[PDB]
Amino acid sequence: SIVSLLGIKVLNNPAKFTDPYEFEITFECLESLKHDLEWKLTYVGSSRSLDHDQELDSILVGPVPVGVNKFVFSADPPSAELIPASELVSVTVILLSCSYDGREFVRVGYYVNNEYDEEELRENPPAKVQVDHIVRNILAEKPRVTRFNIVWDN
């Protein structure tokens, strides 16, 4: 495995639900890569409307040099249209994954705590969700990292 992930810093934590996700990704790379790396951010959270995990955003990391590399993934937030209208899902999940030549080799999973900003709104939750009143807290200090054995260069 050529690209090894070292650390991730969730820079804007906690945040408004509607805020863009800001990750500072640091990985090490042992051989020069012929192509781009692709980082993907997926929203995962319990809903009745069957659901197929929300792909929040994608980003390409340019010509990958050898050594330790740092970058910022500014992912777009989830659309209000694609989250329960009747219930605030208190605990959701965000999946940060990386691909090379169209194959994922790394997946990082985080739990996210979601609650209303107002002291009373938390106690008397409205019939319909106030998206502009949710505050997310990514449990960034505790992620689950998964490696997939993939074909690199040839």
Binding site: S58, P63, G67, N69
Partner: peptide
């Protein structure tokens, strides 16, 4: 699909960078 500039740590300013 958007691109991100990649920073090779070791070489330029970091704390002192304006970007």
């Amino acid at each position: 699909v958007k691109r991100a500039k990649l920073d090779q740590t070791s070489k330029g300013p970091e704390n002192l960078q304006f970007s």
